[PDB]
Amino acid sequence: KHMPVNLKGRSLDSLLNFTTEEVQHLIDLSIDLKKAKYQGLHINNRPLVGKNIAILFQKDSTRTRCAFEVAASDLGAGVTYIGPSGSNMGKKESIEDTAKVLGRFYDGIEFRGFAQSDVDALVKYSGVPVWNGLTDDEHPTQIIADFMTMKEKFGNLKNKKIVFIGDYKNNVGVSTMIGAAFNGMHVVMCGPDNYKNEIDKNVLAKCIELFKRNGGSLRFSTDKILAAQDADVIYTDVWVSLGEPFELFDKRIGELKNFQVDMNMIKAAKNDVIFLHCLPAFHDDHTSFSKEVATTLGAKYPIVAKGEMEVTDEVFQSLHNKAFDQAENRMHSIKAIILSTIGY
Amino acid sequence: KHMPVNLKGRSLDSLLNFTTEEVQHLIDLSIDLKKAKYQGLHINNRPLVGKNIAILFQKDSTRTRCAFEVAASDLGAGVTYIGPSGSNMGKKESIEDTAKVLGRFYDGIEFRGFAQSDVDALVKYSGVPVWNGLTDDEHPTQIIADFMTMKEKFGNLKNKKIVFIGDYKNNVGVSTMIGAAFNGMHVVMCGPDNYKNEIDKNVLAKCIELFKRNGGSLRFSTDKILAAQDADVIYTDVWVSLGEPFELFDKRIGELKNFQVDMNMIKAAKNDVIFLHCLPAFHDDHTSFSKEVATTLGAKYPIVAKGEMEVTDEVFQSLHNKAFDQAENRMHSIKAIILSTIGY
Amino acid sequence: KHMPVNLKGRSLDSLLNFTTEEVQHLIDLSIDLKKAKYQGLHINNRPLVGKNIAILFQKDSTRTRCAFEVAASDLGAGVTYIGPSGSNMGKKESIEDTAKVLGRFYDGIEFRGFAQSDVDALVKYSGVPVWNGLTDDEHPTQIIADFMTMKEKFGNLKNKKIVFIGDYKNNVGVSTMIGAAFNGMHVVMCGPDNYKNEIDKNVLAKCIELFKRNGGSLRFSTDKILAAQDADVIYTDVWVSLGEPFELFDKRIGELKNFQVDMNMIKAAKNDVIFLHCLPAFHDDHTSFSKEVATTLGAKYPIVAKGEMEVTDEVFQSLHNKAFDQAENRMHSIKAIILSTIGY
Amino acid sequence: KHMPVNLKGRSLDSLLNFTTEEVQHLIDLSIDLKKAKYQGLHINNRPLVGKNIAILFQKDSTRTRCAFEVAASDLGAGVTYIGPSGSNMGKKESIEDTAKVLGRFYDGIEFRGFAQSDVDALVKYSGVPVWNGLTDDEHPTQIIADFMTMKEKFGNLKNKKIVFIGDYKNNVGVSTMIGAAFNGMHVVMCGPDNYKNEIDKNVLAKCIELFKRNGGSLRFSTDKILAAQDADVIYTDVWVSLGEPFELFDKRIGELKNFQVDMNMIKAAKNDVIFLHCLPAFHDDHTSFSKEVATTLGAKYPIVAKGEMEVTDEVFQSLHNKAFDQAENRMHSIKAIILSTIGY
């Protein structure tokens, strides 16, 4: 705990492997690096000239990829991008052997893919810093971006209130809960009552320990307008998982229909409440997808009849939506992570 | 609104043409650039080498000129200073033709002069960034300096209270009201009741919209000790306009005599209240001008009998006067404006 | 027009949004940059270090992609290439939302895709320079590279004569007509008389305005040998669309069979005539696709029986063929565009 | 003529002290330097770091001053601007003593003033390069800019035709005659017959000899329409010099009234004629001076009724008007002169 906040050589496999001081360091550094770029300081100060990173994506994730690509370039590192065709592991070669080779060529490795265990193998066998760019269990680069954004707005985050509403058991929802614990905030996980029973219990146990240490609290709710009361932040995510069949679509939005973020919910929160969403969001009919949803389920569920789903265009176009600031911050935060971890 | 805060190529003709996010960006950048200079970072990092700006002054304004000259130089730009003899427009050549030529030689143009319309022509016909260095209608570089100063002192400015007292219908007074709207503060425009009827109504309408969006309020007052109550900032300006004849002098100070900032007013405000003034200020008899005023009107108006006018030396020498910090900040703010607008 | 030529911050969505002076400047700047690279001046002089661009391709376009890659790299910019997987706008996210994030990350964006309105959204919502890499409607980077190539060979182009022959209603043919208008050349659009009624009538009106202003003229023709009289340039394009079905395929070559560029045509033109083709071209049976054509057709259509379609190998091997200089100039012209548009 | 072209240490006192090759060299170097600024090559290549120049203006000439200021700064030199209050030679000190001191401080001297003999003394006693910024006798920097502009439009100028029309005996007229001799052009000095008698005879003799060598011709004329036949260039200047007494105005306009440049004249020339004017031009009523003139006269002289004098606004807005390119070129041409003369 009171050793130096030295992150050289560490991997961002899960944020839970880091102290509260280390997490605050990442967030602060991010803000510093953002401020530095606006001054053009990255023109003459490129500390990773001589370094190369590989960024693997076994499923495409363009936001995370672009953030890695601009952050590394700004720092002076070469980046090689390997998409799904080359990122599939454990099939043609053991992930162990792949790891040992990547560690010979590269100074750092990003990986986005399904199995957290894949990340663990990469970390163990490569010997260089590995950065989890999203797995089934966690989205740790996104955490630094999100809480950095809230901090830019409010300053110190302790005892501030955040509601994550919707499919709160998914990787984003769970990632947000971890961030709330590290920042001593009060979280309300607002959605279907039984979702909380699907959250990995080791994660809950660790968050609980963090809340006791840092402040804030964890609470589950079933009531959107209740949850909203006194909230500084309201954070939502998609109800749908592209690639699953009509049944599960129908099922999910059936469970979720009472939890769409609308002006009602915004109005219940504080005046300065900000809205967050990792994007993309479905908040109108300007997508071919919203359309073939407003059309084929606008019957049963009138709530999606205008394309809108997890949030309404009315909320999305208001001054409360900070999702684009939050989007930009994925770059500054990933830059902080790469710098701390590779070192200047 | 939620597009990127990209100011490249924009002109600072009026601050009203900018979003609230853009205005906060300018203020924050200013603070960043100030902090950077104190570290000597401008020695090796001069992003505008290869660029030149022209700074025109059809009436002399040494504070604005020096700020432009040091800010541009620090950035690495050449500057050419054209005073009143060469800055007069529309007489010897159409301002349109002058604009089209300046835009061929220079990467940016500053202009201080009477007609806002002159600024508009420069912006339209030159095609490069134009910076209004003060016109009859507005003093937008001063706005960034002033609110930067308040922010350095208090942090976030929303719902803080500022009183602008005196000739509150003049360009400084109106400029301060715009800044208050962008920062969600409560303004009291404290002076003669009828002055409010001379304020351009399109400006009021826009400020009103900003207050509704950002917070704070607009209120007119006739009572100095009332206005002061709970104020974080008290901002004043000169009662006189050098170059007008004795009549209007006499007239103005007759209308204004009840609104001089004294220890009474300071004491009514909060303990941490700061005093602001764009300078120069008449607050003692150490000017040949205060003297031939304390002498020829000290009779009728005993309030100016010691040279003092808009403020008393007692207030000016107290720890509340931040006008010299505010003065320094004209440079850092103009540097932020030039950098954002020309780009690194 | 009296305005300074300042392309800074501009998007290249359609050449038609530019003045004649701005088009010449791009052509001349490209020639300069080509000369500067041959002297190795790009090693020590790299004006875009600290900038990053995204190049998006919703259909693969290898030639355009490489040009951007080499151009941006020579300038010192980072580039991130996103292919079809990640470039499809409007399905999983509104193009507006995507555009607003792209602009947070990148300093400029290239986009190649079917709908010109996609380019329009990118320009409106990203806030950064956007470059049309080719849409159904127009190919603006190719235009600059084409007329650059012509200028390199002939000097000032006013009143010189160009024949675009074949499917002159397609995007290359239309683009070429636009380019000729900007250069005051005489164009003859040569092929099936019907094809002229398929050209956007707004594009026609604007070209006619440019011909009147700049010189040259517009004519249509049905006879390639009469069209070739006094021609400085003969420019053609493929007869087929890959992916397109047999019927349409067969229909086109029936319509175009009399419009193949052969030595007879070359000789009807001037002695210094040059031949252009944006490439790839089918001018022999060295492609598996030519063979498939000289077989499934070519009894029915003996022109395509040796694999040659729009042009014969005899012309393609002759000193008249400048298509490879035209190809190299994709890079120099795209460099002029990035440099002008981002700025040094 | 066989001597190397080497202008190092030379003064630009009169162009007539220069060979035809030296004048072409300066025009050509002007074009090269223009192309180089557009690619950003002046950021890293500043051959005059360590040099300082003084630019003296006995009467304010804003356009020439800005050209020197920007040209020198691009090259890396410091510049000291001295206005009328400081540039009055021969009154409080001998010009010879002043020149001796200026040579001790500076590496180059610009001087703008009425007496050519003041330039001669600066040249003789300072020992450094001296550049004539404009005297009663000549405007040598303007000559290089002007003929540069013609060359950029036409290429080789030999045997091409220019008309100088109006007060052709003034320093701009005579200067244009000089530049035309050096370029082998056919000049027609068009205006009041008795003007040709006002032109220095040595100058005429020297020009005659240049035409014989280079291939132009000199010719006077009283018919604006006849003179314009087959003209590639029409160049004019103002009829009035601010500020002589009124009597001289109406005397002048009485003499010049038939020589205003109008679209009838433009149309009598070649289609590609270009119009030039060193500016400011009075071509409408957007200047206070125009109005005062359209008022006091305009009864007596109908042409000047709309504010237009030497050129009509209809021509001035035509695509023929190049005066703004001509204005930009003041800078590049002055840059060629400074660089050639101080040396790299």
Numbering used by the authors:
A (entry chain C), B (entry chain C), C (entry chain A), D (entry chain D): -1 to 342
Show sentences the authors wrote.
The arginine deiminase pathway (ADI) is the most widespread anaerobic route for arginine degradation in microorganisms and performs the conversion of arginine to ornithine, ammonia, and CO2, generating one mole of ATP per mole of arginine consumed. The ADI pathway is composed by three catalytic enzymes: arginine deiminase (ADI, EC 3.5.3.6), ornithine carbamoyltransferase (OTC, EC 2.1.3.3) and carbamate kinase (CK, EC 2.7.2.2). Here we have described the structure of the three enzymes that constitute the gene cluster in the ADI pathway in Mycoplasma penetrans (together with the specific membrane-associated arginine permease coded by arcD gene) and compared them to previous structures of the enzymes. In this regard, M. penetrans possesses and expresses the complete set of the ADI pathway genes at the same time while exhibiting a fermentative metabolism.
Subsequently, OTC processes citrulline and uptakes inorganic phosphate to generate ornithine and carbamoyl phosphate. Two different crystal forms of the OTC from M.penetrans have been refined. The first one belonged to the P213 space group and was refined to 2.6 Å, and the second one belonged to a P321 space group and was refined to 2.5 Å. Despite the different space groups of the two crystal forms, in both cases an identical dodecameric quaternary structure was observed with an exact 23 point-group symmetry. As with all other known OTCs structures, the monomer consists of two domains of approximately similar size, the carbamoyl phosphate-binding domain (or polar domain, residues 1–150) and the ornithine-binding domain (or equatorial domain, residues 151–320). In all cases the dodecamer structure is formed by the interaction of four homotrimers disposed in a tetrahedral manner. The interface between homotrimers that constitute the dodecameric structure is mainly located at the four 3-fold symmetry axes at the vertices of the tetrahedron. In the M.penetrans OTC dodecamer, this interface forms an intermolecular network of hydrogen bonds between Asn42 and Asn43 from the three monomers, which is unique to the sequence of M.penetrans OTC. Thus, whereas the catalytic patch formed by residues His275, Cys276 and Leu277 does not vary its position between the apo- and the substrate-bound forms in the ornithine-binding domain, the loop between Trp237 and Phe247 displays a different conformation in the apo form of the M.penetrans OTC. Interestingly, this loop constitutes the main binding site for ornithine and is formed by the conserved DxxxSMG motif (between β8 and α10) in all OTC structures, except in our structure of M.penetrans OTC, in which methionine is substituted by leucine.
